[PDB]
Write an enzyme that holds these catalytic residues in place. Structure first.
Site, PDB file in Angstrom:
ATOM      1  N   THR B  34      21.293 -18.409  34.897  1.00 38.23           N
ATOM      2  CA  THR B  34      21.558 -19.069  36.168  1.00 38.23           C
ATOM      3  C   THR B  34      20.401 -19.981  36.561  1.00 38.23           C
ATOM      4  O   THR B  34      19.251 -19.791  36.154  1.00 38.23           O
ATOM      5  CB  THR B  34      21.712 -18.043  37.292  1.00 38.23           C
ATOM      6  OG1 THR B  34      20.518 -17.248  37.382  1.00 38.23           O
ATOM      7  CG2 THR B  34      22.907 -17.153  37.051  1.00 38.23           C
ATOM      8  N   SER B  35      20.716 -20.974  37.384  1.00 35.42           N
ATOM      9  CA  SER B  35      19.676 -21.824  37.934  1.00 35.42           C
ATOM     10  C   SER B  35      18.822 -21.034  38.920  1.00 35.42           C
ATOM     11  O   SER B  35      19.296 -20.112  39.591  1.00 35.42           O
ATOM     12  CB  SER B  35      20.291 -23.048  38.602  1.00 35.42           C
ATOM     13  OG  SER B  35      20.952 -23.844  37.633  1.00 35.42           O
ATOM     14  N   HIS B  93      13.111 -17.483  34.095  1.00 33.21           N
ATOM     15  CA  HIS B  93      13.643 -16.188  33.724  1.00 33.21           C
ATOM     16  C   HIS B  93      12.730 -15.520  32.701  1.00 33.21           C
ATOM     17  O   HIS B  93      11.948 -16.168  31.998  1.00 33.21           O
ATOM     18  CB  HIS B  93      15.044 -16.335  33.130  1.00 33.21           C
ATOM     19  CG  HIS B  93      16.087 -16.720  34.127  1.00 33.21           C
ATOM     20  ND1 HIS B  93      16.444 -15.904  35.177  1.00 33.21           N
ATOM     21  CD2 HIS B  93      16.847 -17.833  34.237  1.00 33.21           C
ATOM     22  CE1 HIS B  93      17.386 -16.497  35.890  1.00 33.21           C
ATOM     23  NE2 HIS B  93      17.649 -17.668  35.340  1.00 33.21           N
ATOM     24  N   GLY B  94      12.832 -14.199  32.626  1.00 37.95           N
ATOM     25  CA  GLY B  94      12.077 -13.487  31.613  1.00 37.95           C
ATOM     26  C   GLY B  94      12.591 -12.083  31.419  1.00 37.95           C
ATOM     27  O   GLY B  94      13.494 -11.612  32.116  1.00 37.95           O
ATOM     28  N   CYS B 135      11.179 -12.138  35.540  1.00 39.01           N
ATOM     29  CA  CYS B 135      11.528 -10.735  35.396  1.00 39.01           C
ATOM     30  C   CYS B 135      10.844 -10.123  34.178  1.00 39.01           C
ATOM     31  O   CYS B 135      10.502 -10.809  33.209  1.00 39.01           O
ATOM     32  CB  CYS B 135      13.042 -10.569  35.306  1.00 39.01           C
ATOM     33  SG  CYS B 135      13.847 -10.927  36.884  1.00 39.01           S
TER      34      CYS B 135
END
Lengths: 4, 240, 240, 4
Positions: B34-35, B93-94, B135
Site C-alpha cells: 500500500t501507499s 515498508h519493512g 515495520c
C-alpha cells in the site's frame, strides 16, 4: 493511523 | 596543554556530513504494498530538522531496491574525510531486517555493510546513524494502563519500533516515531547527548500515542522505539 | 513545591531490586556444548559489582532450560513493589534470540515476556535490565586498523556482541564484555547515566581486546557490544 | 580466548  | 578527555566524537570537522533520506511512498502494483500516506510529512520534517543541524540533506523518493543499493554504494564511495558523521533515514515498508524498495526488499545488512569501518575508510571512527521508520514484523503492543576497531563499531540504529512489531504512521501527521524524533531534536540537540535525546523520543512515542481503528485487531495499540547502539563515544550535535 | 522534572527513573525505592545471575558453565554431554571456562570469574565479578550497587544478588549455576523458565516465572511473580528496578544477567552459550540451558535452548523472548508491563505489574514503569553474555551467531569481526504504556517499554538489553556475531570469553580473565561492564560500573556508577556507562563499555571492548588463536579462522578478531534500549527515562544507579 |  496505519501500519508500515 | 592541560588534561584531555576523549569521551565524545569529534563533531567539529568542516562539515557535519550527509543526511540521506529515502522516502518510499508509492510501490509497484505487482508488490501489493500500500501507499504510505503521511510519509511526505515525515520527509519534510526530517529535511528541515537535519538542515538546522547543518547536515547536507539529500532527499530521494520512490527508489527501487536496485536504486537503494546503488545509492548507498555510491555514497559510501564518496570522500567523507571532511565530514564528522553520516546519517541515513529510511522511510518505507519493512519486516525484521528488511526495508522495501518500490519493487521488492533490501536487506538492511547489505545497506549498512557499505559503511563498515573497513569498507568506508573516510568514515572509520565516525558515527554512522541509521534511522529506520518501517515495520519489523506484525506484532501489536496492547499496552498496559498505568590498534584495530571492530568493523561494526560506531553504528547507531534508531528503530521506530521493537523487534517483531508493526510501526505506526498517521496519514495526516506523519509517523509517530519521526514526528517525535524531529520534535526532540529541535528541542534538545543543542543541550543533550544523542542517546538522551532518543530516550526522550522513546518516552514521547510510548506515552503520547495510541492507535485509533474501526478494526478491533488494530485499535488501542501502543509502540516503543528501539535504540540499538554500537557507538563507542558520546554524540553531541553541537561543538565547543 | 518548585518546578519538577521527570526525566530519570525513580531509584530511591527502599530496595534497588533483584539481580539474578544465571551462570551456565557445564552442559549436558548429549547437547555437545563445551564447558565455558572463565564464566565463574564473570559470575563472581558481577556478584560483587551489583552488591556494591545495593542489588539483592541471587547467583544460580548450571540450570536446565526448564529451571531457567521456572526461575524467571517465579521471580516475575514476586512482589517488586518496594524495588526500584530488576536486573537479570545470562551467561551461557547462545545463538540469535536464544540462550542455552544446560540441556537445550530457551527463547530470550520467553524469559523477558514474564516481565512485560502487563504481566509483572509491580515492575510496570520500572527499568528491567537484561545483560546477555552469549553468542548471537557465528560471524567474526575482522576489525580494521586505525494513559497506557507499551508492554515492551522500560526494558534494556545489554548484549555482549553485535547481532549475528560470536561473543568472546577468556578462560583465565572472564568474558571481554563482562570484564569491561564490571570495570565501568565500578568506576562510573556514582557519576554517569547508564547509557553513558554502557558506551564506555562499548569503547573498552572495541579497543582493548583482540583474540589470539592458533587457528587462523579465529585469530585477531574484534568485538563490539550492542546496547538495545527500550527505556523511557535516564537511569542513574545513585539517587539524591 | 574462546567463543560462546
Amino acid at each position: 493511523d496505519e501500519v508500515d | 596543554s592541560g588534561i584531555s578527555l576523549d569521551n565524545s566524537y569529534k563533531m567539529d570537522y568542516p562539515e557535519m556530513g550527509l543526511c540521506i533520506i529515502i522516502n518510499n511512498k508509492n510501490f509497484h502494483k505487482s508488490t501489493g504494498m500500500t501507499s504510505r500516506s503521511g510519509t511526505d510529512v515525515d520527509a519534510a520534517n526530517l529535511r528541515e530538522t537535519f538542515r538546522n543541524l547543518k547536515y547536507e540533506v539529500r532527499n530521494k523518493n520512490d527508489l527501487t531496491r536496485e536504486e537503494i543499493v546503488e545509492l548507498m554504494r555510491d555514497v559510501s564511495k564518496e570522500d567523507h574525510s571532511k565530514r564528522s558523521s553520516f546519517v541515513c533515514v529510511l522511510l518505507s515498508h519493512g519486516e525484521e531486517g528488511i526495508i522495501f524498495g518500490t519493487n521488492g526488499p533490501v536487506d538492511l545488512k547489505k545497506i549498512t555493510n557499505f559503511f563498515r569501518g573497513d569498507r568506508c575508510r573516510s568514515l572509520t571512527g565516525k558515527p554512522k546513524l541509521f534511522i529506520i521508520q518501517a515495520c519489523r514484523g506484525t506484532e501489536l503492543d496492547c499496552g498496559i494502563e498505568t590498534h584495530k576497531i571492530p568493523v561494526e563499531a560506531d553504528f547507531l540504529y534508531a528503530y521506530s519500533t521493537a523487534p517483531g512489531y508493526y510501526s505506526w504512521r498517521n496519514s495526516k501527521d506523519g509517523s509517530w516515531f519521526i514526528q517525535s524524533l524531529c520534535a526532540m531534536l529541535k528541542q534538545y540537540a543543542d543541550k543533550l547527548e544523542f542517546m538522551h535525546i532518543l530516550t526522550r523520543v522513546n518516552r514521547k512515542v510510548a506515552t503520547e500515542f495510541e492507535s485509533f481503528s474501526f478494526d478491533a485487531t488494530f485499535h488501542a495499540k501502543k509502540q516503543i522505539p528501539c535504540i540499538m547502539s554500537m557507538l563507542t563515544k558520546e554524540l553531541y550535535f553541537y561543538h565547543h
